[PDB]
Amino acid sequence: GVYRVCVSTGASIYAGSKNKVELWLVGQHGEVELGSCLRPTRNKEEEFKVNVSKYLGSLLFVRLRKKHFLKEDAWFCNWISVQALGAAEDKYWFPCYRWVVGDGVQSLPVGTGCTTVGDPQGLFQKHREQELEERRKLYQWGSWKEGLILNVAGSKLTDLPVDERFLEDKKIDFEASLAWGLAELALKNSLNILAPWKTLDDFNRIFWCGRSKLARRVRDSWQEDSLFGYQFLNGANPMLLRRSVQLPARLVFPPGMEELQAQLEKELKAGTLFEADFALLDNIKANVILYCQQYLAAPLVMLKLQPDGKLMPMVIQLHLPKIGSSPPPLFLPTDPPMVWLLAKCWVRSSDFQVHELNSHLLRGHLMAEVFTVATMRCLPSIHPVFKLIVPHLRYTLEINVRARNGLVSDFGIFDQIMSTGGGGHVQLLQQAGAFLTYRSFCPPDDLADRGLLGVESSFYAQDALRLWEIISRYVQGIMGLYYKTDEAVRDDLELQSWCREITEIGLQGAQKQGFPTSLQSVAQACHFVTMCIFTCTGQHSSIHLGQLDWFTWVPNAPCTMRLPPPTTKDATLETVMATLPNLHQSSLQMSIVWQLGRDQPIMVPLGQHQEEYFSGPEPRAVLEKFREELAIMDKEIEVRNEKLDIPYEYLRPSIVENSVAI
Ligand SMILES: [Fe+2]
Known part of the structure; x- marks a missing residue:
């Protein structure tokens, strides 16, 4: 059988090898010795025809050995393909895509x-x-x-x-x-x-x-x-934003906050209410840079989806509710410019x-x-x-x-x-x-x-x-x-x-x-x-x-x-x-x-x-x-x-x- 054995070397820098590599073809029935044929040239595909008397049948593996004389050289093998030029057979693919090191005999199965x-x-x-x-x-x-x-x-x-x-x-x-x-x-x-x-x-x-x-x-x-x-x-x-089914339990209201609650209930029944909760940041120790204290927050942001397809923030809470302690202040867009701006900055930092x-x-x-x-x-x-x-x-x-x-x-x-x-x-x-x-x-x-x-x-x-x-x-x-x-x-x-x-x-x-x-x-x-x-x-x-x-x-x-x-x-x-x-x-x-x-x-x-x-x-x-x-x-x-x-x-x-x- 006449076969064209082709071996592809890596495109890296150390992919080529000065060592001589010997191959072997082992199929369904028997195996054949090929010996040292070529030396791995960096980024170079190399093919060669061979003829064997021993019957192999369906090629299953392609064993290889990289023999080195005094100094070993790493070789990044891409793959090896051996196709029958005479018989009407498909090209036998043997993928490697890895480094080949050592005087050990490697074995590559068909792909x-x-x-x-x-x-x-x-x-x-x-x-x-x-x-x-x-x-x-x-x-x-x-x-x-x-x-x-x-x-x-x-x-x-x-x-x-x-x-x-x-x-x-x-x-x-x-x-x-x-x-x-x-x-x-x-x-x-x-x-x-x-x-x-x-x-x-x-x-x-x-x-x-x-x-x-x-x-x-x-x-x-x-x-x-x-x-x-x-x-x-x-x-x-x-990843944090989700549609609200009901109001968040941490969303507690301060005395006086009753008018805003209705605006929240309005959006919930409409199905346009959304909530992003950053409670994961609670009790997380903040960093200390140059002996200076840094700070974190666990905000809650409530938003509504507008008919014109726009999501707008309604309320931002910067702290989680303390059980036994009064509820933390809720911040609204109605607040003074700087006050609303600060609250949005804390949300962006936490995000x-x-x-x-x-x-x-x-x-x-x-x-x-x-x-x-x-x-x-x-x-x-x-x-x-x-x-x-x-x-x-x-x-x-x-x-x-x-x-x-x-x-x-x-x-x-x-x-x-x-x-x-x-x-x-x-x-x-x-x-x-x-x-x-x-x-x-x-x-x-x-x-x-x-x-x-x-x-x-x-x-x-x-x-x-x-x-x-x-x-x-x-x-x-x-x-x-x-x-x-x-x-x-x-x-x-x-x-x-x-x-x-x-x-x-x-x-x-x-x-x-x-x-x-x-x-x-x-x-x-x-x-x-x-x-x-x-x-x-x-x-x-x-x-x-x-x-x-x-x-x-x-x-x-x-x-x-x-x-x-x-x-x-x-x-x-x-x-x-x-x-x-x-x-x-x-x-x-x-x-x-x-x-x-x-x-x-x-x-x-x-x-x-x-x-x-x-x-x-x-x-x-x-x-x-x-x-x-x-x-x-x-x-x-x-x-x-x-x-x-x-x-x-x-x-x-x-x-x-x-x-x-x-
Ligand atoms: Fe990345």
Whole structure:
């Protein structure tokens, strides 16, 4: 048989190897020796024809060995393909996409994919058991802080497996751009070092972060209650807002407040009353920067949806009611300018804290990390489900360790400017585990329980729904090719351990929240994987992407507050200024909002990954349909935003990354 064996080397910097690599072809019936054929050239696809007398049959594996003489050289193998030039057979695909190190003999299965149940021959059975044992030695759980959901084991990036590390081409650009980014900002902001700081207009002096079309709008009108409430719907953090069924029990009224109660009852029966509650911030210890006391608040904001499709704030309560003590003052738009302005600033500051911590870090980065480690420890390379998820898990462990090394680590970024940093952030993050429910990660159920379905004013809910349907079908499409009966899913030990690693191990008992302990059906499994895929794409991008727009104008998103939240209604121009961050803190904030949210040097759009793990044409068809539905969504949304005054685009397949990486 005449075969053209083709081996593809990585496009990295250290991908090429000076060592000679020997291959072997082992099929359904027998195996053949090929020996040293070529030497891995960096970013070079190399093919060659060979002829073997021994009958192989269906090629199952392609074993390789990298022999080194005196100095070993790492080799990042993309894949190996061996096709029969004579017989009418399909090209045998053998995906690798990882680093190859050591004088150990590696084995690459064919890219078809299958499970233990779907492999009755037991051809790949022994292969996957030995691989997973090694996977577990490489991927272990760790604990950055006690009480939180597990993360990857280790402390530094060096503790991460080489395959999870940044490619040398991205690592240099990721760090360079970040360095030049914050320095440029630090330079210009140092000029204001002696500039007056007594009017809110002075905030415009430091403003020079990104200055986008939307970001300018914010500067133009942040004091507008219309934009204020608009952010609860389509802002950077649309997770807290929900439709009110009844008045919040913490919404207690001070003696005299009876007229306002009727305005609240009017909106409730109409079904236009909404509430965003920040009680999670209660009793969280605030930061201490330079021995100066910072302050937090647990506000409540009541809003009404206007017939012209506008959400407007009605009342803001800054403290939670103290049992046994008189009720705290409620602030209304009727209050003096400065008094209402201060209360909105406290709400924006608190939204920032919860956004970055819960919405972003926890619900986005850490959750994904949980999925990542559970995938690598329970699902073998050949597993069909494993091949579906991996692109979405790209560069996740790396960016997370980078965060726990200076972004949220002790004496890190939060501690330096964030009011929650310095202890309270962990307190807020640890206690936020209870709010992590299975339904909250699924749009069809999230907006359902909250009550944002059908709300035309909420573009997030719409886009979240549409996107979820597309993904859902893609997973259903892939899972359908490998799971035809519910018993298949039910008896998939690997699949069952994966789901176990997540709900029970990773998430520390998430069954009490809503996460399943076992996937017994096919439709249930499809919903779980979609939930995973969505968390590493949509859930993160819908929260990450708005940072450059809303958190750049400090007055709209204060990183900290120098004065405690007002207990009386007598705020003045100076007090608002004193409460808000000074030039020292605000400027640092802007330079840091660029870190937690920005455009990545090289970015991979949702569903647009290059690594090919499947070999069949059927899996590909499903992949192509997925890319098709996404493309048409990205265009339609683009057209829709034309008519929109403030275009919502945080869920567009073109800018929505395929994995959590920034
Ligand atoms: Fe992010």
